[PDB]
Write a protein that binds this ligand. Sequence first.
Ligand code: HEM
Length: 153
Amino acid sequence: VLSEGEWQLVLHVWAKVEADVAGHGQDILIRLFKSHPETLEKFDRFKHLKTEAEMKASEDLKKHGVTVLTALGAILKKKGHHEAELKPLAQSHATKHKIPIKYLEFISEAIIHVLHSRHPGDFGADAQGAMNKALELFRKDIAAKYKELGYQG
Ligand code: HEM
């Protein structure tokens, strides 16, 4: 359970992301796909992209970055009371998109890296620990719905 102090750190940095959702979305997806190429293969939409420059040029990938960070932002702003927003996301990611929990760990690492690069004055170590705990809570609750459906592995 995050404390109120920790939620404040999280959402303070997140408000900064909200000034340039698309730029962040791009940088996060690019880092995820460069860091962990097996993730790119889960998107039939993007698996033609073979270089970072092609990724950076893809308007469709920038569109999807906005979709992902708008959904994450809505879950963060519920401060833990996010069951209505995770249900559908876990459902689709386990049964339709087939994303293992470990790749949710990978995208959390890429979110933390991009927020440290773009917002270092609002993302010192207190705020990095808090964002880590928020993203862990997201993964714990998606993992519990996976397990329900037979996809925790
Ligand atoms: C912060 C973590 C994530 C969030 C909030 C998120 C959010 C979303 C949303 C809102 C959609 C469209 C609605 C839906 O299908 O449920 C979506 C689609 C999808 N996501 Fe995620 N996602 C995350 C992590 C990932 C990861 C780590 C992968 C793959 C490694 C992935 C793969 C997919 C795929 C394949 C689609 C369908 C894209 C398409 O072909 O249109 N997601 N995601």
